[PDB]
Amino acid sequence: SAAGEQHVIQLNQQGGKNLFCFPPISGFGIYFKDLALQLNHKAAVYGFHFIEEDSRIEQYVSRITEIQPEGPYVLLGYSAGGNLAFEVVQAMEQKGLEVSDFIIVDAYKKDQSITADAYLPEAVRETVMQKKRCYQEYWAQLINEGRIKSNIHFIEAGIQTETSGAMVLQKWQDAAEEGYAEYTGYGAHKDMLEGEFAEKNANIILNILDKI
């Protein structure tokens, strides 16, 4: 890393399975705080940030194996983080590492590149927003290709008021070499891992972990 810092926060106690979590477009691992609270002393939740450097994938693999030197590994991605994590899974597998299970919380397989999407002095505002801007640019250009060996667990939103026929085609069935499962979770997309819904969606995640 740029300054020897890390790009992940351990958000609850160690124990059970390690769950390596990749963030939504806001870009910071603290996003997973509510999930971590719900899984405290059940699974160890590590919340990654979006790494701005082009070597990000290698760095994620390096950090995961530092934390947990022996597989198999379990990864999770929420929203944009599902698309990012899929790339990390592929990288890990290409190195011969075993990713047993990949939990995708309301992310949709990204098949084409697209165009990218206060209380602060403008100079601070720009620095503070840099990670999210970088992530927006990375996500816009990103294309998830092919399959992973890892079992896929797709957890969709429980409230869905604007589903396209196009989105239903991008629920990751074509991305599984082996195991695929789909689950209806709780809440609208933006709310799933926060507030009241974190508890209900965490139960799904734990049930998945418990069945491995």
PDB file of C-alpha atoms in Angstrom, residues 31-210:
ATOM      1  CA  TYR A  31     -20.228  -0.012   5.638  1.00  0.00           C
ATOM      2  CA  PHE A  32     -20.333  -3.556   7.099  1.00  0.00           C
ATOM      3  CA  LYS A  33     -20.606  -2.400  10.708  1.00  0.00           C
ATOM      4  CA  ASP A  34     -24.262  -3.356  11.098  1.00  0.00           C
ATOM      5  CA  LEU A  35     -23.699  -6.755   9.527  1.00  0.00           C
ATOM      6  CA  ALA A  36     -20.713  -7.294  11.836  1.00  0.00           C
ATOM      7  CA  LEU A  37     -22.791  -6.417  14.869  1.00  0.00           C
ATOM      8  CA  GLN A  38     -25.399  -8.983  13.894  1.00  0.00           C
ATOM      9  CA  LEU A  39     -22.745 -11.678  13.310  1.00  0.00           C
ATOM     10  CA  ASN A  40     -20.724 -10.903  16.435  1.00  0.00           C
ATOM     11  CA  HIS A  41     -19.303 -14.186  17.882  1.00  0.00           C
ATOM     12  CA  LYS A  42     -20.840 -16.098  14.970  1.00  0.00           C
ATOM     13  CA  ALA A  43     -18.583 -15.103  12.051  1.00  0.00           C
ATOM     14  CA  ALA A  44     -15.658 -12.731  11.815  1.00  0.00           C
ATOM     15  CA  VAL A  45     -16.557  -9.871   9.468  1.00  0.00           C
ATOM     16  CA  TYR A  46     -13.711  -8.072   7.639  1.00  0.00           C
ATOM     17  CA  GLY A  47     -14.836  -4.975   5.725  1.00  0.00           C
ATOM     18  CA  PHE A  48     -12.556  -4.014   2.824  1.00  0.00           C
ATOM     19  CA  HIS A  49     -12.275  -0.609   1.302  1.00  0.00           C
ATOM     20  CA  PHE A  50     -12.018   0.047  -2.427  1.00  0.00           C
ATOM     21  CA  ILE A  51      -8.285   0.177  -3.214  1.00  0.00           C
ATOM     22  CA  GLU A  52      -7.639   2.961  -5.724  1.00  0.00           C
ATOM     23  CA  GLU A  53      -4.373   1.565  -7.114  1.00  0.00           C
ATOM     24  CA  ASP A  54      -4.496  -0.655 -10.214  1.00  0.00           C
ATOM     25  CA  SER A  55      -2.852  -3.467  -8.251  1.00  0.00           C
ATOM     26  CA  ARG A  56      -5.998  -3.634  -6.017  1.00  0.00           C
ATOM     27  CA  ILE A  57      -6.825  -7.283  -6.882  1.00  0.00           C
ATOM     28  CA  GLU A  58      -3.373  -8.523  -5.946  1.00  0.00           C
ATOM     29  CA  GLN A  59      -3.487  -6.512  -2.737  1.00  0.00           C
ATOM     30  CA  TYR A  60      -6.857  -8.023  -1.722  1.00  0.00           C
ATOM     31  CA  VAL A  61      -5.547 -11.525  -2.314  1.00  0.00           C
ATOM     32  CA  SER A  62      -2.420 -10.703  -0.299  1.00  0.00           C
ATOM     33  CA  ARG A  63      -4.418  -9.318   2.626  1.00  0.00           C
ATOM     34  CA  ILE A  64      -6.903 -12.175   2.714  1.00  0.00           C
ATOM     35  CA  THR A  65      -4.169 -14.808   2.869  1.00  0.00           C
ATOM     36  CA  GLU A  66      -2.304 -12.801   5.518  1.00  0.00           C
ATOM     37  CA  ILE A  67      -5.351 -12.772   7.740  1.00  0.00           C
ATOM     38  CA  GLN A  68      -6.171 -16.395   6.928  1.00  0.00           C
ATOM     39  CA  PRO A  69      -3.146 -18.327   5.647  1.00  0.00           C
ATOM     40  CA  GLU A  70      -5.092 -21.575   4.879  1.00  0.00           C
ATOM     41  CA  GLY A  71      -8.264 -21.916   2.801  1.00  0.00           C
ATOM     42  CA  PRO A  72     -10.925 -22.487   1.992  1.00  0.00           C
ATOM     43  CA  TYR A  73     -12.117 -18.867   1.864  1.00  0.00           C
ATOM     44  CA  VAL A  74     -15.529 -17.243   1.937  1.00  0.00           C
ATOM     45  CA  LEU A  75     -16.134 -13.900   0.270  1.00  0.00           C
ATOM     46  CA  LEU A  76     -19.142 -11.576   0.272  1.00  0.00           C
ATOM     47  CA  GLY A  77     -19.950  -8.539  -1.887  1.00  0.00           C
ATOM     48  CA  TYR A  78     -22.849  -6.117  -1.573  1.00  0.00           C
ATOM     49  CA  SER A  79     -24.000  -4.112  -4.629  1.00  0.00           C
ATOM     50  CA  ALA A  80     -20.898  -2.804  -6.510  1.00  0.00           C
ATOM     51  CA  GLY A  81     -18.850  -4.938  -4.115  1.00  0.00           C
ATOM     52  CA  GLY A  82     -20.429  -8.069  -5.601  1.00  0.00           C
ATOM     53  CA  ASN A  83     -18.902  -7.124  -8.971  1.00  0.00           C
ATOM     54  CA  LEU A  84     -15.544  -6.321  -7.393  1.00  0.00           C
ATOM     55  CA  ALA A  85     -15.463  -9.422  -5.225  1.00  0.00           C
ATOM     56  CA  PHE A  86     -16.202 -11.664  -8.230  1.00  0.00           C
ATOM     57  CA  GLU A  87     -12.901 -10.436  -9.751  1.00  0.00           C
ATOM     58  CA  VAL A  88     -11.101 -11.224  -6.488  1.00  0.00           C
ATOM     59  CA  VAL A  89     -12.593 -14.723  -6.432  1.00  0.00           C
ATOM     60  CA  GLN A  90     -11.326 -15.320 -10.005  1.00  0.00           C
ATOM     61  CA  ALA A  91      -7.861 -14.093  -9.009  1.00  0.00           C
ATOM     62  CA  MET A  92      -7.722 -16.329  -6.009  1.00  0.00           C
ATOM     63  CA  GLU A  93      -8.848 -19.350  -7.947  1.00  0.00           C
ATOM     64  CA  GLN A  94      -6.337 -18.632 -10.755  1.00  0.00           C
ATOM     65  CA  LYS A  95      -3.646 -18.876  -8.056  1.00  0.00           C
ATOM     66  CA  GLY A  96      -4.924 -22.258  -6.942  1.00  0.00           C
ATOM     67  CA  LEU A  97      -6.615 -21.010  -3.770  1.00  0.00           C
ATOM     68  CA  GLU A  98      -9.964 -22.571  -2.745  1.00  0.00           C
ATOM     69  CA  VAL A  99     -12.914 -20.172  -2.422  1.00  0.00           C
ATOM     70  CA  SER A 100     -15.630 -22.501  -1.123  1.00  0.00           C
ATOM     71  CA  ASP A 101     -18.522 -20.020  -1.250  1.00  0.00           C
ATOM     72  CA  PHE A 102     -19.249 -16.549  -2.549  1.00  0.00           C
ATOM     73  CA  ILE A 103     -22.187 -14.586  -1.109  1.00  0.00           C
ATOM     74  CA  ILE A 104     -23.583 -11.891  -3.409  1.00  0.00           C
ATOM     75  CA  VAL A 105     -25.992  -9.486  -1.782  1.00  0.00           C
ATOM     76  CA  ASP A 106     -28.153  -7.822  -4.458  1.00  0.00           C
ATOM     77  CA  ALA A 107     -25.415  -7.288  -7.034  1.00  0.00           C
ATOM     78  CA  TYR A 108     -26.109  -8.140 -10.686  1.00  0.00           C
ATOM     79  CA  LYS A 109     -23.422  -9.583 -13.034  1.00  0.00           C
ATOM     80  CA  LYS A 110     -21.949  -6.678 -15.021  1.00  0.00           C
ATOM     81  CA  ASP A 111     -21.812  -7.711 -18.673  1.00  0.00           C
ATOM     82  CA  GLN A 112     -20.998  -4.411 -20.401  1.00  0.00           C
ATOM     83  CA  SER A 113     -18.899  -1.341 -19.743  1.00  0.00           C
ATOM     84  CA  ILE A 114     -20.784   1.895 -19.355  1.00  0.00           C
ATOM     85  CA  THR A 115     -20.196   5.611 -18.761  1.00  0.00           C
ATOM     86  CA  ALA A 116     -19.186   6.503 -15.204  1.00  0.00           C
ATOM     87  CA  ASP A 117     -21.584   7.865 -12.602  1.00  0.00           C
ATOM     88  CA  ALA A 118     -20.742  20.269   2.121  1.00  0.00           C
ATOM     89  CA  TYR A 119     -19.415  21.126   5.602  1.00  0.00           C
ATOM     90  CA  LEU A 120     -16.087  20.966   3.705  1.00  0.00           C
ATOM     91  CA  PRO A 121     -13.750  23.324   1.860  1.00  0.00           C
ATOM     92  CA  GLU A 122     -13.692  22.391  -1.860  1.00  0.00           C
ATOM     93  CA  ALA A 123     -10.093  21.024  -1.526  1.00  0.00           C
ATOM     94  CA  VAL A 124     -11.074  18.706   1.315  1.00  0.00           C
ATOM     95  CA  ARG A 125     -14.351  17.730  -0.405  1.00  0.00           C
ATOM     96  CA  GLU A 126     -12.351  16.566  -3.450  1.00  0.00           C
ATOM     97  CA  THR A 127      -9.971  14.400  -1.384  1.00  0.00           C
ATOM     98  CA  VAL A 128     -12.782  12.954   0.718  1.00  0.00           C
ATOM     99  CA  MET A 129     -14.770  11.974  -2.441  1.00  0.00           C
ATOM    100  CA  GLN A 130     -11.787  10.565  -4.308  1.00  0.00           C
ATOM    101  CA  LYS A 131     -12.305   6.904  -3.310  1.00  0.00           C
ATOM    102  CA  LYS A 132     -15.932   6.835  -4.413  1.00  0.00           C
ATOM    103  CA  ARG A 133     -15.043   8.644  -7.675  1.00  0.00           C
ATOM    104  CA  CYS A 134     -12.270   6.127  -8.380  1.00  0.00           C
ATOM    105  CA  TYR A 135     -14.667   3.248  -7.572  1.00  0.00           C
ATOM    106  CA  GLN A 136     -17.369   4.705  -9.882  1.00  0.00           C
ATOM    107  CA  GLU A 137     -14.822   4.826 -12.723  1.00  0.00           C
ATOM    108  CA  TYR A 138     -13.543   1.327 -12.006  1.00  0.00           C
ATOM    109  CA  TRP A 139     -17.075  -0.113 -11.781  1.00  0.00           C
ATOM    110  CA  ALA A 140     -18.187   1.621 -14.984  1.00  0.00           C
ATOM    111  CA  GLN A 141     -15.379  -0.002 -16.993  1.00  0.00           C
ATOM    112  CA  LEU A 142     -15.634  -3.336 -15.257  1.00  0.00           C
ATOM    113  CA  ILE A 143     -16.926  -6.429 -17.022  1.00  0.00           C
ATOM    114  CA  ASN A 144     -17.438  -9.641 -15.080  1.00  0.00           C
ATOM    115  CA  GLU A 145     -16.688 -12.572 -17.443  1.00  0.00           C
ATOM    116  CA  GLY A 146     -17.363 -16.259 -17.153  1.00  0.00           C
ATOM    117  CA  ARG A 147     -17.470 -18.396 -14.071  1.00  0.00           C
ATOM    118  CA  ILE A 148     -15.996 -19.290 -10.738  1.00  0.00           C
ATOM    119  CA  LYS A 149     -15.605 -22.648  -9.123  1.00  0.00           C
ATOM    120  CA  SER A 150     -16.837 -21.269  -5.814  1.00  0.00           C
ATOM    121  CA  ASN A 151     -20.453 -21.978  -4.927  1.00  0.00           C
ATOM    122  CA  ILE A 152     -22.532 -18.869  -5.534  1.00  0.00           C
ATOM    123  CA  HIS A 153     -25.161 -17.695  -3.048  1.00  0.00           C
ATOM    124  CA  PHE A 154     -27.259 -14.876  -4.530  1.00  0.00           C
ATOM    125  CA  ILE A 155     -29.380 -12.949  -2.004  1.00  0.00           C
ATOM    126  CA  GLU A 156     -31.785 -10.545  -3.712  1.00  0.00           C
ATOM    127  CA  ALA A 157     -33.750  -7.627  -2.234  1.00  0.00           C
ATOM    128  CA  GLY A 158     -37.115  -8.444  -0.640  1.00  0.00           C
ATOM    129  CA  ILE A 159     -38.591  -5.227  -1.998  1.00  0.00           C
ATOM    130  CA  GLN A 160     -38.178  -4.713  -5.710  1.00  0.00           C
ATOM    131  CA  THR A 161     -40.196  -2.007  -7.384  1.00  0.00           C
ATOM    132  CA  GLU A 162     -38.323  -1.639 -10.685  1.00  0.00           C
ATOM    133  CA  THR A 163     -36.964  -4.992 -11.888  1.00  0.00           C
ATOM    134  CA  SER A 164     -36.162  -5.233 -15.605  1.00  0.00           C
ATOM    135  CA  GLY A 165     -36.146  -8.438 -17.638  1.00  0.00           C
ATOM    136  CA  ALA A 166     -32.482  -7.504 -18.199  1.00  0.00           C
ATOM    137  CA  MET A 167     -31.652  -7.623 -14.459  1.00  0.00           C
ATOM    138  CA  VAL A 168     -33.263 -11.047 -13.964  1.00  0.00           C
ATOM    139  CA  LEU A 169     -30.830 -12.333 -16.622  1.00  0.00           C
ATOM    140  CA  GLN A 170     -27.922 -11.057 -14.497  1.00  0.00           C
ATOM    141  CA  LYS A 171     -28.523 -13.097 -11.353  1.00  0.00           C
ATOM    142  CA  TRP A 172     -25.263 -15.088 -11.740  1.00  0.00           C
ATOM    143  CA  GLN A 173     -26.628 -18.475 -12.871  1.00  0.00           C
ATOM    144  CA  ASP A 174     -24.168 -18.403 -15.817  1.00  0.00           C
ATOM    145  CA  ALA A 175     -21.283 -17.582 -13.479  1.00  0.00           C
ATOM    146  CA  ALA A 176     -21.316 -20.825 -11.499  1.00  0.00           C
ATOM    147  CA  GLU A 177     -19.198 -23.852 -12.439  1.00  0.00           C
ATOM    148  CA  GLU A 178     -20.788 -25.916  -9.739  1.00  0.00           C
ATOM    149  CA  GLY A 179     -23.107 -24.667  -7.022  1.00  0.00           C
ATOM    150  CA  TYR A 180     -25.676 -21.958  -7.396  1.00  0.00           C
ATOM    151  CA  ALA A 181     -28.395 -20.941  -4.971  1.00  0.00           C
ATOM    152  CA  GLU A 182     -30.771 -18.007  -4.829  1.00  0.00           C
ATOM    153  CA  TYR A 183     -32.427 -16.544  -1.757  1.00  0.00           C
ATOM    154  CA  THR A 184     -34.902 -13.761  -1.263  1.00  0.00           C
ATOM    155  CA  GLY A 185     -33.649 -11.463   1.454  1.00  0.00           C
ATOM    156  CA  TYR A 186     -35.277  -8.586   3.263  1.00  0.00           C
ATOM    157  CA  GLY A 187     -35.729  -4.932   2.404  1.00  0.00           C
ATOM    158  CA  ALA A 188     -35.082  -2.802  -0.629  1.00  0.00           C
ATOM    159  CA  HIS A 189     -31.660  -2.850  -2.223  1.00  0.00           C
ATOM    160  CA  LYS A 190     -30.235   0.139  -0.340  1.00  0.00           C
ATOM    161  CA  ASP A 191     -31.489  -0.985   3.025  1.00  0.00           C
ATOM    162  CA  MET A 192     -30.485  -4.662   3.164  1.00  0.00           C
ATOM    163  CA  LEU A 193     -27.407  -4.491   5.384  1.00  0.00           C
ATOM    164  CA  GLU A 194     -28.516  -1.603   7.574  1.00  0.00           C
ATOM    165  CA  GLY A 195     -31.068  -0.980  10.299  1.00  0.00           C
ATOM    166  CA  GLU A 196     -33.826  -3.550  10.782  1.00  0.00           C
ATOM    167  CA  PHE A 197     -32.895  -5.540   7.748  1.00  0.00           C
ATOM    168  CA  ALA A 198     -29.322  -6.341   8.746  1.00  0.00           C
ATOM    169  CA  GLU A 199     -30.625  -8.706  11.350  1.00  0.00           C
ATOM    170  CA  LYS A 200     -32.855 -10.605   8.945  1.00  0.00           C
ATOM    171  CA  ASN A 201     -30.282 -10.734   6.148  1.00  0.00           C
ATOM    172  CA  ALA A 202     -27.505 -11.700   8.547  1.00  0.00           C
ATOM    173  CA  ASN A 203     -29.542 -14.775   9.537  1.00  0.00           C
ATOM    174  CA  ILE A 204     -29.471 -15.847   5.853  1.00  0.00           C
ATOM    175  CA  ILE A 205     -25.750 -15.301   5.661  1.00  0.00           C
ATOM    176  CA  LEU A 206     -25.152 -17.270   8.866  1.00  0.00           C
ATOM    177  CA  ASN A 207     -27.374 -20.114   7.666  1.00  0.00           C
ATOM    178  CA  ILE A 208     -25.257 -20.251   4.518  1.00  0.00           C
ATOM    179  CA  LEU A 209     -22.027 -20.298   6.525  1.00  0.00           C
ATOM    180  CA  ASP A 210     -23.453 -22.966   8.876  1.00  0.00           C
TER     181      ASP A 210
END
